[PDB]
Each structure stands twice: as C-alpha cells, then as structure tokens.
PDB file of C-alpha atoms in Angstrom:
ATOM      1  CA  UNK A   1       1.255   0.485  20.713  1.00  0.00           C
ATOM      2  CA  UNK A   2       2.105   3.819  18.930  1.00  0.00           C
ATOM      3  CA  UNK A   3       0.667   5.177  15.684  1.00  0.00           C
ATOM      4  CA  UNK A   4       2.294   7.941  13.661  1.00  0.00           C
ATOM      5  CA  UNK A   5       0.358  10.118  11.192  1.00  0.00           C
ATOM      6  CA  UNK A   6       1.739  12.441   8.465  1.00  0.00           C
ATOM      7  CA  UNK A   7      -0.226  15.515   7.343  1.00  0.00           C
ATOM      8  CA  UNK A   8      -0.478  18.399   4.859  1.00  0.00           C
ATOM      9  CA  UNK A   9      -0.613  20.558   8.047  1.00  0.00           C
ATOM     10  CA  UNK A  10       3.246  20.201   8.131  1.00  0.00           C
ATOM     11  CA  UNK A  11       3.315  17.954  11.227  1.00  0.00           C
ATOM     12  CA  UNK A  12       3.590  14.359  12.312  1.00  0.00           C
ATOM     13  CA  UNK A  13       1.427  13.281  15.235  1.00  0.00           C
ATOM     14  CA  UNK A  14       2.077  10.320  17.612  1.00  0.00           C
ATOM     15  CA  UNK A  15      -0.918   8.568  19.221  1.00  0.00           C
ATOM     16  CA  UNK A  16      -1.686   5.553  21.407  1.00  0.00           C
ATOM     17  CA  UNK A  17      -4.238   2.805  20.619  1.00  0.00           C
ATOM     18  CA  UNK A  18      -6.710   4.345  23.073  1.00  0.00           C
ATOM     19  CA  UNK A  19      -6.837   7.489  20.943  1.00  0.00           C
ATOM     20  CA  UNK A  20      -4.702   9.864  23.046  1.00  0.00           C
ATOM     21  CA  UNK A  21      -2.491  12.418  21.248  1.00  0.00           C
ATOM     22  CA  UNK A  22       1.010  11.968  22.703  1.00  0.00           C
ATOM     23  CA  UNK A  23       3.226  14.286  20.663  1.00  0.00           C
ATOM     24  CA  UNK A  24       3.302  16.594  17.624  1.00  0.00           C
ATOM     25  CA  UNK A  25       6.537  16.801  15.568  1.00  0.00           C
ATOM     26  CA  UNK A  26       6.903  20.375  14.318  1.00  0.00           C
ATOM     27  CA  UNK A  27       9.531  21.816  12.022  1.00  0.00           C
ATOM     28  CA  UNK A  28       8.982  20.925   8.376  1.00  0.00           C
ATOM     29  CA  UNK A  29       8.179  23.980   6.269  1.00  0.00           C
ATOM     30  CA  UNK A  30       5.700  22.263   3.893  1.00  0.00           C
ATOM     31  CA  UNK A  31       3.370  19.237   3.820  1.00  0.00           C
ATOM     32  CA  UNK A  32       4.520  15.968   5.382  1.00  0.00           C
ATOM     33  CA  UNK A  33       3.936  13.169   2.859  1.00  0.00           C
ATOM     34  CA  UNK A  34       4.898  10.004   4.779  1.00  0.00           C
ATOM     35  CA  UNK A  35       6.284   8.657   8.046  1.00  0.00           C
ATOM     36  CA  UNK A  36       8.123   5.547   9.351  1.00  0.00           C
ATOM     37  CA  UNK A  37       9.527   4.179  12.639  1.00  0.00           C
ATOM     38  CA  UNK A  38      13.003   2.727  13.128  1.00  0.00           C
ATOM     39  CA  UNK A  39      12.988  -1.030  13.939  1.00  0.00           C
ATOM     40  CA  UNK A  40      13.496  -0.295  17.624  1.00  0.00           C
ATOM     41  CA  UNK A  41      10.533   2.110  17.641  1.00  0.00           C
ATOM     42  CA  UNK A  42      12.471   5.022  19.178  1.00  0.00           C
ATOM     43  CA  UNK A  43      13.285   7.155  16.086  1.00  0.00           C
ATOM     44  CA  UNK A  44      10.649   8.576  13.701  1.00  0.00           C
ATOM     45  CA  UNK A  45      11.417   9.621  10.111  1.00  0.00           C
ATOM     46  CA  UNK A  46       9.227  12.067   8.180  1.00  0.00           C
ATOM     47  CA  UNK A  47       9.208  12.903   4.428  1.00  0.00           C
ATOM     48  CA  UNK A  48       8.178  16.386   3.238  1.00  0.00           C
ATOM     49  CA  UNK A  49       7.438  18.599   0.224  1.00  0.00           C
ATOM     50  CA  UNK A  50      10.113  20.873   1.784  1.00  0.00           C
ATOM     51  CA  UNK A  51      12.547  18.384   0.035  1.00  0.00           C
ATOM     52  CA  UNK A  52      13.962  16.840   3.271  1.00  0.00           C
ATOM     53  CA  UNK A  53      13.588  13.851   5.533  1.00  0.00           C
ATOM     54  CA  UNK A  54      13.711  14.678   9.266  1.00  0.00           C
ATOM     55  CA  UNK A  55      14.523  12.307  12.137  1.00  0.00           C
ATOM     56  CA  UNK A  56      12.917  12.786  15.568  1.00  0.00           C
ATOM     57  CA  UNK A  57      12.602  11.120  18.968  1.00  0.00           C
ATOM     58  CA  UNK A  58       9.401  10.534  20.958  1.00  0.00           C
ATOM     59  CA  UNK A  59       9.918  13.777  22.998  1.00  0.00           C
ATOM     60  CA  UNK A  60       9.540  15.690  19.721  1.00  0.00           C
ATOM     61  CA  UNK A  61      13.191  16.670  19.426  1.00  0.00           C
ATOM     62  CA  UNK A  62      14.504  17.210  15.900  1.00  0.00           C
ATOM     63  CA  UNK A  63      17.580  14.998  15.648  1.00  0.00           C
ATOM     64  CA  UNK A  64      18.689  15.305  12.019  1.00  0.00           C
ATOM     65  CA  UNK A  65      17.727  16.715   8.617  1.00  0.00           C
ATOM     66  CA  UNK A  66      18.594  14.756   5.424  1.00  0.00           C
ATOM     67  CA  UNK A  67      19.188  17.285   2.609  1.00  0.00           C
ATOM     68  CA  UNK A  68      19.954  16.282  -0.984  1.00  0.00           C
ATOM     69  CA  UNK A  69      16.787  15.724  -3.038  1.00  0.00           C
ATOM     70  CA  UNK A  70      16.041  18.536  -5.506  1.00  0.00           C
ATOM     71  CA  UNK A  71      12.216  18.236  -5.239  1.00  0.00           C
ATOM     72  CA  UNK A  72       9.522  16.985  -2.818  1.00  0.00           C
ATOM     73  CA  UNK A  73      10.175  13.823  -0.793  1.00  0.00           C
ATOM     74  CA  UNK A  74       7.141  11.541  -1.161  1.00  0.00           C
ATOM     75  CA  UNK A  75       7.979   8.560   1.129  1.00  0.00           C
ATOM     76  CA  UNK A  76      10.545   7.170   3.567  1.00  0.00           C
ATOM     77  CA  UNK A  77      11.512   3.721   4.965  1.00  0.00           C
ATOM     78  CA  UNK A  78      14.077   2.180   7.373  1.00  0.00           C
ATOM     79  CA  UNK A  79      15.990  -1.012   6.587  1.00  0.00           C
ATOM     80  CA  UNK A  80      15.120  -4.017   8.805  1.00  0.00           C
ATOM     81  CA  UNK A  81      18.563  -3.684  10.481  1.00  0.00           C
ATOM     82  CA  UNK A  82      17.913   0.037  11.096  1.00  0.00           C
ATOM     83  CA  UNK A  83      21.243   1.061   9.544  1.00  0.00           C
ATOM     84  CA  UNK A  84      19.969   2.557   6.197  1.00  0.00           C
ATOM     85  CA  UNK A  85      17.160   5.015   5.371  1.00  0.00           C
ATOM     86  CA  UNK A  86      15.585   5.146   1.920  1.00  0.00           C
ATOM     87  CA  UNK A  87      13.747   8.224   0.555  1.00  0.00           C
ATOM     88  CA  UNK A  88      11.532   8.615  -2.567  1.00  0.00           C
ATOM     89  CA  UNK A  89      11.321  11.903  -4.463  1.00  0.00           C
ATOM     90  CA  UNK A  90       9.584  13.892  -7.214  1.00  0.00           C
ATOM     91  CA  UNK A  91      13.155  14.475  -8.517  1.00  0.00           C
ATOM     92  CA  UNK A  92      12.853  10.912 -10.029  1.00  0.00           C
ATOM     93  CA  UNK A  93      15.379   9.266  -7.625  1.00  0.00           C
ATOM     94  CA  UNK A  94      15.528   7.181  -4.440  1.00  0.00           C
ATOM     95  CA  UNK A  95      18.332   8.156  -2.035  1.00  0.00           C
ATOM     96  CA  UNK A  96      19.920   5.897   0.569  1.00  0.00           C
ATOM     97  CA  UNK A  97      21.347   7.427   3.763  1.00  0.00           C
ATOM     98  CA  UNK A  98      22.942   6.368   7.024  1.00  0.00           C
ATOM     99  CA  UNK A  99      21.408   7.237  10.406  1.00  0.00           C
ATOM    100  CA  UNK A 100      23.650  10.298  10.806  1.00  0.00           C
ATOM    101  CA  UNK A 101      22.203  11.855   7.670  1.00  0.00           C
ATOM    102  CA  UNK A 102      25.015  11.149   5.221  1.00  0.00           C
ATOM    103  CA  UNK A 103      24.125  10.243   1.603  1.00  0.00           C
ATOM    104  CA  UNK A 104      25.235   6.747   0.589  1.00  0.00           C
ATOM    105  CA  UNK A 105      23.701   6.248  -2.885  1.00  0.00           C
ATOM    106  CA  UNK A 106      21.340   7.783  -5.471  1.00  0.00           C
ATOM    107  CA  UNK A 107      19.216   5.296  -7.429  1.00  0.00           C
ATOM    108  CA  UNK A 108      18.703   6.687 -10.950  1.00  0.00           C
ATOM    109  CA  UNK A 109      16.478   5.179 -13.672  1.00  0.00           C
ATOM    110  CA  UNK A 110      12.818   6.155 -13.205  1.00  0.00           C
ATOM    111  CA  UNK A 111      11.567   8.598 -15.856  1.00  0.00           C
ATOM    112  CA  UNK A 112       9.028  10.413 -13.666  1.00  0.00           C
ATOM    113  CA  UNK A 113       8.347  11.150  -9.931  1.00  0.00           C
ATOM    114  CA  UNK A 114       9.072   8.387  -7.409  1.00  0.00           C
ATOM    115  CA  UNK A 115       5.981   8.053  -5.144  1.00  0.00           C
ATOM    116  CA  UNK A 116       7.024   5.440  -2.504  1.00  0.00           C
ATOM    117  CA  UNK A 117       9.780   3.107  -1.346  1.00  0.00           C
ATOM    118  CA  UNK A 118      10.097  -0.120   0.686  1.00  0.00           C
ATOM    119  CA  UNK A 119      12.836  -2.557   1.828  1.00  0.00           C
ATOM    120  CA  UNK A 120      12.712  -6.357   1.475  1.00  0.00           C
ATOM    121  CA  UNK A 121      12.655  -8.292   4.801  1.00  0.00           C
ATOM    122  CA  UNK A 122      16.196  -9.473   4.301  1.00  0.00           C
ATOM    123  CA  UNK A 123      17.222  -5.831   3.754  1.00  0.00           C
ATOM    124  CA  UNK A 124      18.891  -6.596   0.424  1.00  0.00           C
ATOM    125  CA  UNK A 125      16.372  -5.245  -2.145  1.00  0.00           C
ATOM    126  CA  UNK A 126      14.800  -1.785  -2.404  1.00  0.00           C
ATOM    127  CA  UNK A 127      11.525  -1.365  -4.295  1.00  0.00           C
ATOM    128  CA  UNK A 128      10.380   1.990  -5.674  1.00  0.00           C
ATOM    129  CA  UNK A 129       7.031   3.082  -7.143  1.00  0.00           C
ATOM    130  CA  UNK A 130       6.775   5.738  -9.842  1.00  0.00           C
ATOM    131  CA  UNK A 131       4.463   7.909 -11.935  1.00  0.00           C
ATOM    132  CA  UNK A 132       6.326   6.333 -14.890  1.00  0.00           C
ATOM    133  CA  UNK A 133       3.940   3.347 -14.394  1.00  0.00           C
ATOM    134  CA  UNK A 134       6.633   0.937 -13.010  1.00  0.00           C
ATOM    135  CA  UNK A 135       8.061  -0.493  -9.822  1.00  0.00           C
ATOM    136  CA  UNK A 136      11.856  -0.893  -9.860  1.00  0.00           C
ATOM    137  CA  UNK A 137      13.978  -3.254  -7.710  1.00  0.00           C
ATOM    138  CA  UNK A 138      17.515  -2.274  -6.730  1.00  0.00           C
ATOM    139  CA  UNK A 139      20.385  -3.358  -4.516  1.00  0.00           C
ATOM    140  CA  UNK A 140      22.050  -1.208  -1.868  1.00  0.00           C
ATOM    141  CA  UNK A 141      24.871  -0.343  -4.297  1.00  0.00           C
ATOM    142  CA  UNK A 142      22.252   1.398  -6.456  1.00  0.00           C
ATOM    143  CA  UNK A 143      22.227  -1.167  -9.258  1.00  0.00           C
ATOM    144  CA  UNK A 144      18.934  -1.694 -11.076  1.00  0.00           C
ATOM    145  CA  UNK A 145      17.832  -5.335 -10.815  1.00  0.00           C
ATOM    146  CA  UNK A 146      14.320  -5.477 -12.364  1.00  0.00           C
ATOM    147  CA  UNK A 147      11.535  -3.260 -13.751  1.00  0.00           C
ATOM    148  CA  UNK A 148       7.978  -4.414 -13.028  1.00  0.00           C
ATOM    149  CA  UNK A 149       5.735  -3.303 -15.903  1.00  0.00           C
ATOM    150  CA  UNK A 150       1.995  -3.749 -16.425  1.00  0.00           C
ATOM    151  CA  UNK A 151       0.101  -0.943 -14.685  1.00  0.00           C
ATOM    152  CA  UNK A 152      -1.721   1.406 -17.068  1.00  0.00           C
ATOM    153  CA  UNK A 153      -1.254   4.578 -15.001  1.00  0.00           C
ATOM    154  CA  UNK A 154       0.944   5.958 -12.164  1.00  0.00           C
ATOM    155  CA  UNK A 155       2.105   3.601  -9.423  1.00  0.00           C
ATOM    156  CA  UNK A 156       1.393   5.297  -6.068  1.00  0.00           C
ATOM    157  CA  UNK A 157       2.864   2.864  -3.504  1.00  0.00           C
ATOM    158  CA  UNK A 158       4.677  -0.416  -3.003  1.00  0.00           C
ATOM    159  CA  UNK A 159       5.132  -3.075  -0.300  1.00  0.00           C
ATOM    160  CA  UNK A 160       7.010  -6.335   0.300  1.00  0.00           C
ATOM    161  CA  UNK A 161       5.438  -9.347   1.885  1.00  0.00           C
ATOM    162  CA  UNK A 162       6.990 -10.461   5.212  1.00  0.00           C
ATOM    163  CA  UNK A 163       8.499 -13.446   3.423  1.00  0.00           C
ATOM    164  CA  UNK A 164      10.257 -11.313   0.789  1.00  0.00           C
ATOM    165  CA  UNK A 165       8.957 -13.344  -2.165  1.00  0.00           C
ATOM    166  CA  UNK A 166       5.924 -11.231  -3.185  1.00  0.00           C
ATOM    167  CA  UNK A 167       5.652  -7.513  -4.076  1.00  0.00           C
ATOM    168  CA  UNK A 168       2.429  -5.518  -4.122  1.00  0.00           C
ATOM    169  CA  UNK A 169       1.928  -2.237  -6.029  1.00  0.00           C
ATOM    170  CA  UNK A 170      -0.930   0.300  -5.950  1.00  0.00           C
ATOM    171  CA  UNK A 171      -1.933   2.361  -8.998  1.00  0.00           C
ATOM    172  CA  UNK A 172      -4.024   5.213 -10.382  1.00  0.00           C
ATOM    173  CA  UNK A 173      -5.370   2.542 -12.791  1.00  0.00           C
ATOM    174  CA  UNK A 174      -7.643   1.409  -9.841  1.00  0.00           C
ATOM    175  CA  UNK A 175      -5.837  -1.917  -9.233  1.00  0.00           C
ATOM    176  CA  UNK A 176      -3.292  -3.537  -6.961  1.00  0.00           C
ATOM    177  CA  UNK A 177      -0.864  -5.908  -8.697  1.00  0.00           C
ATOM    178  CA  UNK A 178       1.077  -8.784  -7.079  1.00  0.00           C
ATOM    179  CA  UNK A 179       4.530  -9.749  -8.433  1.00  0.00           C
ATOM    180  CA  UNK A 180       7.501 -12.075  -7.833  1.00  0.00           C
ATOM    181  CA  UNK A 181      11.092 -10.837  -7.410  1.00  0.00           C
ATOM    182  CA  UNK A 182      11.835 -11.831 -11.029  1.00  0.00           C
ATOM    183  CA  UNK A 183       9.402  -9.213 -12.311  1.00  0.00           C
ATOM    184  CA  UNK A 184       6.612 -11.606 -13.234  1.00  0.00           C
ATOM    185  CA  UNK A 185       3.030 -10.451 -12.785  1.00  0.00           C
ATOM    186  CA  UNK A 186       1.096 -12.895 -10.561  1.00  0.00           C
ATOM    187  CA  UNK A 187      -2.325 -11.278 -10.034  1.00  0.00           C
ATOM    188  CA  UNK A 188      -4.401  -8.107 -10.556  1.00  0.00           C
ATOM    189  CA  UNK A 189      -6.795  -7.123  -7.755  1.00  0.00           C
ATOM    190  CA  UNK A 190      -9.840  -5.309  -9.113  1.00  0.00           C
ATOM    191  CA  UNK A 191     -12.697  -3.774  -7.175  1.00  0.00           C
ATOM    192  CA  UNK A 192     -11.815  -0.230  -6.224  1.00  0.00           C
ATOM    193  CA  UNK A 193     -13.762   2.397  -8.182  1.00  0.00           C
ATOM    194  CA  UNK A 194     -11.048   5.085  -8.176  1.00  0.00           C
ATOM    195  CA  UNK A 195      -7.204   5.388  -7.801  1.00  0.00           C
ATOM    196  CA  UNK A 196      -5.492   3.057  -5.319  1.00  0.00           C
ATOM    197  CA  UNK A 197      -3.210   5.222  -3.157  1.00  0.00           C
ATOM    198  CA  UNK A 198      -1.332   2.717  -0.932  1.00  0.00           C
ATOM    199  CA  UNK A 199      -0.891  -0.959  -0.132  1.00  0.00           C
ATOM    200  CA  UNK A 200       0.356  -3.094   2.768  1.00  0.00           C
ATOM    201  CA  UNK A 201       0.806  -6.760   3.776  1.00  0.00           C
ATOM    202  CA  UNK A 202      -0.364  -8.218   7.074  1.00  0.00           C
ATOM    203  CA  UNK A 203       2.512  -9.569   9.210  1.00  0.00           C
ATOM    204  CA  UNK A 204       1.481 -13.179   8.513  1.00  0.00           C
ATOM    205  CA  UNK A 205       1.515 -12.464   4.765  1.00  0.00           C
ATOM    206  CA  UNK A 206      -2.039 -13.845   4.393  1.00  0.00           C
ATOM    207  CA  UNK A 207      -3.819 -10.495   3.817  1.00  0.00           C
ATOM    208  CA  UNK A 208      -3.274  -7.434   1.581  1.00  0.00           C
ATOM    209  CA  UNK A 209      -4.844  -4.062   2.428  1.00  0.00           C
ATOM    210  CA  UNK A 210      -5.372  -1.336  -0.159  1.00  0.00           C
ATOM    211  CA  UNK A 211      -6.286   2.339   0.282  1.00  0.00           C
ATOM    212  CA  UNK A 212      -8.269   4.249  -2.363  1.00  0.00           C
ATOM    213  CA  UNK A 213      -9.665   7.610  -3.529  1.00  0.00           C
ATOM    214  CA  UNK A 214     -12.978   5.701  -3.526  1.00  0.00           C
ATOM    215  CA  UNK A 215     -13.023   6.380   0.299  1.00  0.00           C
ATOM    216  CA  UNK A 216     -12.519   2.712   1.317  1.00  0.00           C
ATOM    217  CA  UNK A 217      -9.868   0.283   2.463  1.00  0.00           C
ATOM    218  CA  UNK A 218     -10.200  -3.191   0.961  1.00  0.00           C
ATOM    219  CA  UNK A 219      -8.714  -6.417   2.309  1.00  0.00           C
ATOM    220  CA  UNK A 220      -7.693  -9.274  -0.009  1.00  0.00           C
ATOM    221  CA  UNK A 221      -6.263 -12.801   0.206  1.00  0.00           C
ATOM    222  CA  UNK A 222      -3.243 -14.025  -1.782  1.00  0.00           C
ATOM    223  CA  UNK A 223      -5.447 -15.220  -4.648  1.00  0.00           C
ATOM    224  CA  UNK A 224      -6.690 -11.684  -5.175  1.00  0.00           C
ATOM    225  CA  UNK A 225     -10.147 -12.453  -3.809  1.00  0.00           C
ATOM    226  CA  UNK A 226     -11.795  -9.503  -2.121  1.00  0.00           C
ATOM    227  CA  UNK A 227     -12.596 -10.251   1.497  1.00  0.00           C
ATOM    228  CA  UNK A 228     -13.772  -7.081   3.171  1.00  0.00           C
ATOM    229  CA  UNK A 229     -14.361  -3.374   2.491  1.00  0.00           C
ATOM    230  CA  UNK A 230     -13.844  -0.864   5.362  1.00  0.00           C
ATOM    231  CA  UNK A 231     -16.244   2.047   4.945  1.00  0.00           C
ATOM    232  CA  UNK A 232     -16.391   5.154   7.117  1.00  0.00           C
ATOM    233  CA  UNK A 233     -13.975   7.766   5.881  1.00  0.00           C
ATOM    234  CA  UNK A 234     -15.749  10.656   4.182  1.00  0.00           C
ATOM    235  CA  UNK A 235     -12.941  11.627   1.751  1.00  0.00           C
ATOM    236  CA  UNK A 236     -10.143   9.822  -0.138  1.00  0.00           C
ATOM    237  CA  UNK A 237      -8.088   7.260   1.828  1.00  0.00           C
ATOM    238  CA  UNK A 238      -4.375   8.023   1.275  1.00  0.00           C
ATOM    239  CA  UNK A 239      -2.540   5.173   3.045  1.00  0.00           C
ATOM    240  CA  UNK A 240      -2.902   2.045   5.136  1.00  0.00           C
ATOM    241  CA  UNK A 241      -0.827   0.010   7.624  1.00  0.00           C
ATOM    242  CA  UNK A 242      -1.100  -3.125   9.781  1.00  0.00           C
ATOM    243  CA  UNK A 243      -0.050  -3.337  13.424  1.00  0.00           C
ATOM    244  CA  UNK A 244       2.815  -5.788  14.198  1.00  0.00           C
ATOM    245  CA  UNK A 245       0.432  -8.222  15.989  1.00  0.00           C
ATOM    246  CA  UNK A 246      -1.777  -7.986  12.834  1.00  0.00           C
ATOM    247  CA  UNK A 247      -4.925  -7.390  14.952  1.00  0.00           C
ATOM    248  CA  UNK A 248      -5.316  -3.686  13.983  1.00  0.00           C
ATOM    249  CA  UNK A 249      -5.445  -1.789  10.660  1.00  0.00           C
ATOM    250  CA  UNK A 250      -4.862   1.992  10.421  1.00  0.00           C
ATOM    251  CA  UNK A 251      -6.104   4.196   7.547  1.00  0.00           C
ATOM    252  CA  UNK A 252      -5.136   7.783   6.659  1.00  0.00           C
ATOM    253  CA  UNK A 253      -7.564  10.142   4.888  1.00  0.00           C
ATOM    254  CA  UNK A 254      -8.130  13.568   3.307  1.00  0.00           C
ATOM    255  CA  UNK A 255     -11.042  13.818   5.813  1.00  0.00           C
ATOM    256  CA  UNK A 256      -8.217  14.824   8.258  1.00  0.00           C
ATOM    257  CA  UNK A 257      -8.433  11.669  10.419  1.00  0.00           C
ATOM    258  CA  UNK A 258      -6.776   8.308  11.005  1.00  0.00           C
ATOM    259  CA  UNK A 259      -9.170   5.408  11.628  1.00  0.00           C
ATOM    260  CA  UNK A 260      -8.224   2.201  13.484  1.00  0.00           C
ATOM    261  CA  UNK A 261     -10.073  -1.036  12.662  1.00  0.00           C
ATOM    262  CA  UNK A 262      -9.940  -4.668  13.657  1.00  0.00           C
ATOM    263  CA  UNK A 263      -9.681  -7.721  11.441  1.00  0.00           C
ATOM    264  CA  UNK A 264     -13.514  -8.084  11.221  1.00  0.00           C
ATOM    265  CA  UNK A 265     -14.056  -4.539   9.897  1.00  0.00           C
ATOM    266  CA  UNK A 266     -15.256  -2.934  13.116  1.00  0.00           C
ATOM    267  CA  UNK A 267     -14.197   0.671  13.716  1.00  0.00           C
ATOM    268  CA  UNK A 268     -12.152   0.994  16.906  1.00  0.00           C
ATOM    269  CA  UNK A 269     -11.084   4.666  16.980  1.00  0.00           C
ATOM    270  CA  UNK A 270     -11.015   7.937  14.990  1.00  0.00           C
ATOM    271  CA  UNK A 271      -7.907  10.115  15.641  1.00  0.00           C
ATOM    272  CA  UNK A 272      -8.847  13.800  15.228  1.00  0.00           C
ATOM    273  CA  UNK A 273      -6.530  16.794  15.520  1.00  0.00           C
ATOM    274  CA  UNK A 274      -4.723  17.329  12.209  1.00  0.00           C
ATOM    275  CA  UNK A 275      -5.875  20.545  10.518  1.00  0.00           C
ATOM    276  CA  UNK A 276      -5.318  19.296   6.903  1.00  0.00           C
ATOM    277  CA  UNK A 277      -5.349  15.984   4.990  1.00  0.00           C
ATOM    278  CA  UNK A 278      -3.625  13.011   6.563  1.00  0.00           C
ATOM    279  CA  UNK A 279      -1.207  11.665   3.915  1.00  0.00           C
ATOM    280  CA  UNK A 280       0.221   8.517   5.572  1.00  0.00           C
ATOM    281  CA  UNK A 281       0.272   6.349   8.674  1.00  0.00           C
ATOM    282  CA  UNK A 282       2.654   3.872  10.382  1.00  0.00           C
ATOM    283  CA  UNK A 283       2.726   1.631  13.483  1.00  0.00           C
ATOM    284  CA  UNK A 284       5.711   1.339  15.810  1.00  0.00           C
ATOM    285  CA  UNK A 285       7.232  -2.202  15.862  1.00  0.00           C
ATOM    286  CA  UNK A 286       5.566  -2.914  19.205  1.00  0.00           C
TER     287      UNK A 286
END
C-alpha cells in the first residue's frame, strides 16, 4: 500500500496507491540512489552519493546514519529477518550493518564500483552487481562463494527469485541474464535497445521485469520469452519493482516520475513531485 521513490533531488518520497504524496524524507546532502523498506514496513533505508545510508520512519524522522563507505552508496537492502542491512558502493565493497548502524562486515573482491545488492529469501546469501562485469555471491561472514561471469559490460542491478534458486542480473550490454546459485548461466534475455538499469522478480517467481535506458519496462517469463513492453516514460527508466500481491508494477525514470502499472500493461498512476531524476523505487511489504 506504500511506494517509496529515490531521487537526484536528494529526497525520498512516500506515496499511496491512489497517488497521494504522504511524506518527503529530507536530510541527505547529495543524490539518493536507492531505497528499501524493512520487512515490517515501518523503517525506510535510503542510499546516497553523500556516502551514507540513512534510516527513517514514516513520520519523516531521521533515525540513524550508517557511515563507513569511502565513496557513493549505490543501493541498499534489508535481510528477510530484518536484522541486517546491506549497502553497495562505488568504493568497490558491500558493507553489512545491524539496525543500530554498527558495521558487521566488509565484502571485498569486486574490481570496480558495486552498483546494487540483494539478499536471498533464506537470508543466507548476498548478491552484488558490479561495473567489473560480474555478480558475486557471498555469505554473511563476508566469504566469497561464487562469481557469475558472462555479461559483456557493467552489471547495473541484481535480484533473487522468491524461491532462492534463480538470480537475475541487468547490464549495460542490453541484456538480463538468469543464473543458478552455482554460477551457471541459464538464459540471456534480449530485446532492449539500450542499457538495462534494473531487474526484479514477481512474488510468484513466474515473471521478470527489466528497466532500461530505452525508456521501457519489459516483462518476461522464466524461459526468457518477452511477454509485454510498458511504454509511457519519456526518458530512461532507472528501476522497477513489483508489489507484494504481484498485481502492480512500479517504474522509476529520469523523466522525474514513478509510474504504476497493472499486470496487463495498463497505466494506473503517474507520481509527480520530484524535481530531478527518480533513481529507484520500492513497495512496502503490505
């Protein structure tokens, strides 16, 4: 029932499905690059080029600042149990933190910026995307488990399926790739005409959504067959998310809006109010 949007205007905004602006989270000193909700939906985390993650409540109160990366933070995620936060950074690391802001681990191994991060559904694997053209899988002790190789250019985003067996990656090489947890390449999804900027799984695991600089969202089945292309944004699409009931898709764009869509490609709502590019979007667990 609540949508969060991240923006180059240095804020997060919270909205309802009817299009009302509920709250603006103000306090980062540079662009906000991604956003996530805790599993209980009551805490929001934001990632920023000001090199921090910030934690907020729905009244807009700043609750905590996570300081420790040496360059921009590019993405943030909560573990399924809510106890651990993961952050991705241009400083080439992922950091793991507890909810009070203390650093637990630094995951070292990528050779270029880390662009996104995700947890497996069982909470036991972390996946990271990088400009070094790989996804890496790690445990919560920081040990490297696998390196997923095969993209020809930067990897911009990564997602787990709800059943924790399949990984999806998005890339500047204009494809999404699907993988197993052993690092094997299963499928390449081709069809976008420019960089793919983000990827997500539907909650039933049957559908993949991709966002692209080609101004569209595309929806795909598990065999990599293109189902549907969502057209309407007027500038690059920078991220995509599914609602928990899987009946709504949200897209973020450099055209400064979020758009909400249903499963048949109809446009439901356009959320207007950010003064710069929208860089990411998330749904609360309800």
